[PDB]
């Protein structure tokens, strides 16, 4: 009967200091994850048009 928001509140969302720690760690991991996902979405939209897609023809 303890749910996931209940555990999140009882562990991380209760105190302001550990709340801010959760915010900072989530900011780091979400920055990496969002950058990776948005970059991959951009590559899939623009397949075969970018320099990172066409450099292998002209290198080595």
């Amino acid at each position: 009967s303890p749910t996931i928001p209940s555990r999140l509140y009882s562990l991380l969302f209760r105190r302001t200091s550990t709340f801010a720690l959760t915010i900072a760690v989530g900011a780091l991991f979400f920055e990496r994850a969002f950058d990776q996902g948005a970059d991959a979405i951009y590559e899939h939209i623009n397949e075969g048009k970018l320099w990172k897609h066409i450099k292998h023809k002209y290198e080595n």
């Binding site: 209940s6 969302f13 709340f19």
Partner: protein, 110 residues
């Protein structure tokens, strides 16, 4: 309270990510630019200068000293000991080539 604070924490994470990005872009904007990055590394050089002379150029914003040395100076600076200096380092470790010496003009005092 966990649901409401999860919403609040996700908003704060988003604002923190956007704020870090925009502050990083501003800081990198007032950092070095493409022109000063291009004009720093590449250096055109000639060999129309005799031995025992000095040439002053611009390399990485600094006065670049290209000195053509004489054999007497090379022999003296190879024969001088490093135990009496403030930092033990001889000419064969300071420079790769005896004829040409490449240095900076930025003095280590002011």
């Amino acid at each position: 309270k966990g649901f409401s604070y999860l919403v609040t924490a996700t908003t704060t994470v988003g604002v923190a990510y956007a704020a870090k990005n925009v502050v990083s872009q501003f800081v990198s904007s007032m950092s070095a630019s493409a022109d000063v990055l291009a004009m720093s590394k590449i250096e055109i050089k000639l060999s129309d200068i005799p031995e025992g002379k000095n040439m002053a150029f611009k390399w990485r914003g600094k006065p670049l000293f290209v000195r053509h040395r004489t054999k007497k100076e090379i022999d003296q600076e190879a024969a001088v000991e490093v135990s009496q200096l403030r930092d033990p380092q001889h000419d064969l470790d300071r420079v790769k080539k005896p004829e040409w010496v490449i240095l900076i003009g930025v003095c280590t005092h002011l």
